[PDB]
Curated annotation (Swiss-Prot), chains A, B, C, D:
The C-terminal ANK repeats prevent the assembly of the supra-tetrameric filaments. A highly mobile activation loop at the dimer-dimer interface is important for enzyme activity. Coiled coil: none annotated. Catalyzes the first reaction in the primary pathway for the renal catabolism of glutamine. Plays a role in maintaining acid-base homeostasis. Regulates the levels of the neurotransmitter glutamate, the main excitatory neurotransmitter in the brain. Isoform 1 and isoform 3 are detected in brain cortex. Isoform 3 is highly expressed in astrocytoma, ganglioglioma and ependymoma. Isoform 1 is highly expressed in brain and kidney, but not detected in liver. Isoform 3 is highly expressed in heart and pancreas, detected at lower levels in placenta, lung, pancreas and kidney, but is not detected in liver. Isoform 2 is expressed in cardiac and skeletal muscle. This is Glutaminase kidney isoform, mitochondrial. It is linked to Developmental and epileptic encephalopathy 71: A form of epileptic encephalopathy, a heterogeneous group of severe early-onset epilepsies characterized by refractory seizures, neurodevelopmental impairment, and poor prognosis. Development is normal prior to seizure onset, after which cognitive and motor delays become apparent. DEE71 is an autosomal recessive form with onset at birth. Death occurs in first weeks of life. CASGID syndrome: An autosomal dominant disease characterized by infantile-onset cataract, erythematic subcutaneous nodules, profound developmental delay, self-injurious behavior, and intracerebral glutamate excess. Histopathologic analysis of skin lesions show deep perivascular and periglandular lymphohistiocytic infiltrates and pronounced leukocytoclasia at the surface of the dermis, focal vacuolar alterations, hyperkeratosis, and parakeratosis of the epidermis. Synthesized as a 74-kDa cytosolic precursor which is proteolytically processed by the mitochondrial-processing peptidase (MPP) via a 72-kDa intermediate to yield the mature mitochondrial 68- and 65-kDa subunits. It comes from Homo sapiens (Human).
């Protein structure tokens, strides 16, 4: 209970929101039309406490693609169904670059961690093995529905189509992983890439995503349904890797000044988690050099300076 | 209050201690005689809660050198006296290797972080500038006394003499930093290295060190004196960097499975901090390939599995 | 005229051949059946002087695939038809690893040199642009025929089929180059990879290949037909890059002790050139850790110690 | 005899000299006053054939420090007295960066090659072991006198004093090599650095240096005295490593377009060798980004385009 009075806190969220609104820097991702379309002025913040209390300000009901934000979510699912040991048999846990700047794999021929494309691609191949992509996709959709307490969870076919058609780097990664036997026996690599592109194209709203974050903040229990969605083990692992590998190269600076588990996405979203307190989703298309939403980064630094949510405060 | 009953908890510390005692692997550091001397069977664990409650088991009153364990301590001192902004003008905050495996500096010509020699060396040059080494040394000694609530804090002249005489790598680092203008204007580099070697040679006991850790766990207040020793800012920064850069290359695996701020030393010590709960010091000379005490690493993994102290539990 | 008496020299080639024959180390490449099939005892050496004088010893009429040996040949063709400036607009000239160990591209997003797969793949895309692969292939075949003075130049469909079906790393490279716009406008990357696999599957004999080498040693004139096949510019460039990037990581040790332009291949072949004197082809399936024929490497070191052919002798 | 008529050739050297004279780019090295002093307009070229025929144009009698130009010379001396095998027990032969950009040592803890500071420093420690620096210095001076056929060979005490006083990077290298046991048993590292600084401070003129180059071009025989100065083995090794590691990072581009053994120096000198034809020394203080004399680089590219001296022409 670091939030004795929700109303007053809500009032502070609005002030912070308003302050970050003045930050107009950054560039909206434009490698595909579906991302370039977005207005640089879209800005929204949704909060969902461990209690189930809600608060939204700004453009919180405009759908956008999770993109990389889906990474910790599918990682959580894999750990939930397969266990920590099995999953990390295929992907690493190291947050460092190590001496592996832009390398698809580490010295042991394993993706560095679940938060980079190579890792997410490997994780994607571990979920619900043995069924067609249609079934795998439905499986994860149901899962995301539970995390969001049945709130908005859609799909962008146009993003999926464009992401796949222009994802040369991901295909390069897919073939290299095949070279090094990084997938489980009998994996259809190209088929896995399709599933990966689809997952990146799943849509949410600031409001529904915040519930997803709140579930991770509530030990794996959806705050608005009470249902156990993810195992404690899955949640703890996800938060650890989000804390260390979730904000691209800004992770170091982010962990030092913000000290919270988070995962950004090229659509401008930032899934934020305040363990045992609340889940949050900040969204604003304009990204900085590192690929993180400018307004989002600003907002997070401000949230911690004001409410002292840093893990080591 | 995650420790409702101190006595019962104490009983669990003994069981864990006993279990790690069976782990006889590792090699006692032997690059200098002062470290080689130590018996591989020395093993002790001291606990000091935020309350001021104490508990020790094993060889908790045998002096040993902090060595790298002193790094977060002098970093805390620098931040306390100079502030976050000034200090990081000279040293980085990145926990990753990045693509800088064994490099003395990063692309901006700054040590990666305060937890590696190059960084500690730079930090050492920022403390109490303008006075002779004798005065700087006394200054830090008084400081460590306050952190330990006036408990055991000694000095090993033999270690200092040997460390300096055989520290070629540190001298190489010292000259490279001089090359790149990494020190404050007018710094006597060789004189700074002496101070650095001296600090690494400061002695403590598991019992006194645990109080130091408890001070960091108590927001900067010594649990057994009530005195404010370090600013909140200094404590938070220290814990962040300990969490990410304190266990050498094992940091990644350590953060994932243990999730606690810690700093190891070549003497076999591991300064452990459980934020808002307790401070700890585990000591056992035999080190693993990574340079961390074998019994210590084992003990830490066990402590978290049993008492659920992981930051994301 | 460093070979006043061809007969006596021929006698020395036989002694060297015989001496290398005792070197039974190495492993026959076995990533595909077409390479694993080969007997580790196959060993042949063919010489073709700038005069047109010939000499063969051992298994000099057994067909084998050029594999990487074709790299300097297609590079020569590209330079011959397009010129030095145009070609190096797409591929580098640096022989070093630089700090790019196993990276597909350098900092300027260009393959390091024509002698590594990424470079050969790019070079392949520059030759005879605008026609179907059938026409490109015939074009290069005619070219290789001229270099060999119409001697044996075949094709292994089985090798081509296997190389393509198991070439995941090359496909990874193909997609990454597409990512970075490394190909000429309108290139069909997958179609280029097919052409690349085909070229690697071209067959020769020690005898025909030696004529090809002799052509490079004769300023671009086929020693046994007198026809100008390659421009002087093309020949000089090819020899420079062969000297520095032709023997995989052994290039450094090879340039120092042998000092001759050469290109090895996974089939066990080593295209050797002694500028203004002769061309040679050594073949022996067993490769060393670096991927070079064991008997071949031995033979080359011996040839230089005996006849003083080192470029700086 | 690629120079049938020396007079006409001499006439071409003047035209090339004149053409490079128009190249006013570059920056005169200024890390120490002794180098900053030099006028950016100083420009001279001296030629000394294997015959003993001479030709100079420009500022060919103005003393300047060999600096890095002395590297292949002391390497030659070491090989001459100790043999190839012994010397490379301490230093590598690899020309590549490998993945060792700015690293003092390679994976085997050996300097990459004799042409970089770490290597030159190691080589310096192998020459005339067991005598004081005064004796070592005299020993090398006599040696350089023989290479220059007793022509100008001086010493800059001011450069030596400044180089040593500001050579922090070299001291960093010196301590790191000591860390890794890179020197022969019982080496006085600091004493070796003094000797190294002294050697870099040896002075020559374009005219005397060209004779030194001619000696290397004449298989180790001083063209103007007939005396055997260096063993054939020493000369061949020196030329190989000059060809691949003598022009700093420009080596790759230099080997491709110029194809001649060369070694540059921060004073603006470029020791050039045309095997079996002539030795040359180009000097012009203004250096390019890579650290090579601008006029010198231009002149070399021109010399090869006109007279076809490229090793593979
Ligand atoms: S980029 C290109 C495709 C990759 N190539 N190598 C990769 N990872 C490693 O190669 C591991 C390694 C890192 C450092 C040392 C050895 C091995 S990923
Ligand atoms: S080890 C040797 C002494 C050092 N040399 N370079 C160092 N750090 C960088 O050189 C920064 C850099 C890292 C990656 C790229 C550029 C610059 S430390
Ligand atoms: S392996 C993986 C696929 C590649 N990723 N990066 C590559 N080449 C560079 O990334 C150039 C670079 C080298 C060193 C510094 C910057 C940029 S290739
Ligand atoms: S810069 C700093 C001082 C140096 N640190 N490490 C160096 N050379 C290696 O560390 C060899 C290595 C290169 C690549 C992989 C392993 C080992 S030099």
């Amino acid at each position: 209970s670091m939030i004795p009075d929700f109303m007053s806190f809500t009032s502070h969220i609005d002030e912070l929101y308003e302050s970050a609104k003045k930050q107009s820097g950054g560039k909206v991702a434009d490698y595909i039309p579906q991302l370039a379309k977005f207005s640089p002025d879209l800005w929204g913040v949704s909060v969902c406490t461990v209690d189930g209390q809600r608060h939204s300000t700004g453009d919180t009901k405009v759908p956008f693609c999770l993109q990389s934000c889906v990474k910790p979510l599918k990682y959580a699912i894999a750990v939930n169904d397969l266990g920590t040991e099995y999953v990390h048999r295929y992907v690493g846990k190291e947050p460092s670059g190590l001496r592996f700047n832009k390398l698809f794999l580490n010295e042991d021929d394993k993706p560095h961690n679940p938060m980079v494309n190579a890792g997410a691609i490997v994780v994607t191949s571990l979920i619900k093995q043995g069924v067609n992509n249609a079934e795998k996709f439905d499986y994860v959709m149901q899962f995301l529905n539970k995390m969001a307490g049945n709130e908005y969870v859609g799909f962008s076919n146009a993003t999926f189509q464009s992401e796949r058609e222009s994802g040369d780097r991901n295909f390069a990664i897919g073939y290299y992983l095949k070279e090094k036997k990084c997938f489980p026996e009998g994996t259809d690599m190209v088929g896995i890439l399709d599933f990966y592109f689809q997952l990146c194209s799943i849509e949410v709203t600031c409001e529904s995503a915040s519930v997803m974050a709140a579930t991770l903040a509530n030990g794996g229990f959806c705050p608005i349904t009470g249902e156990r969605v993810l195992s404690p083990e899955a949640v703890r692992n996800t938060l650890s890797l989000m804390h260390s590998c979730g904000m691209y190269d800004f992770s170091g600076q982010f962990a030092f000044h913000v000290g919270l588990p988070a995962k950004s996405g090229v659509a401008g979203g930032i899934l934020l988690v305040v363990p045992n307190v609340m889940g949050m989703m900040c969204w604003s298309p304009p990204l900085d050099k590192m690929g993180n939403s400018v307004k989002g980064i600003h907002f997070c630094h401000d949230l911690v300076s004001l409410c002292n949510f840093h893990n080591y405060d």
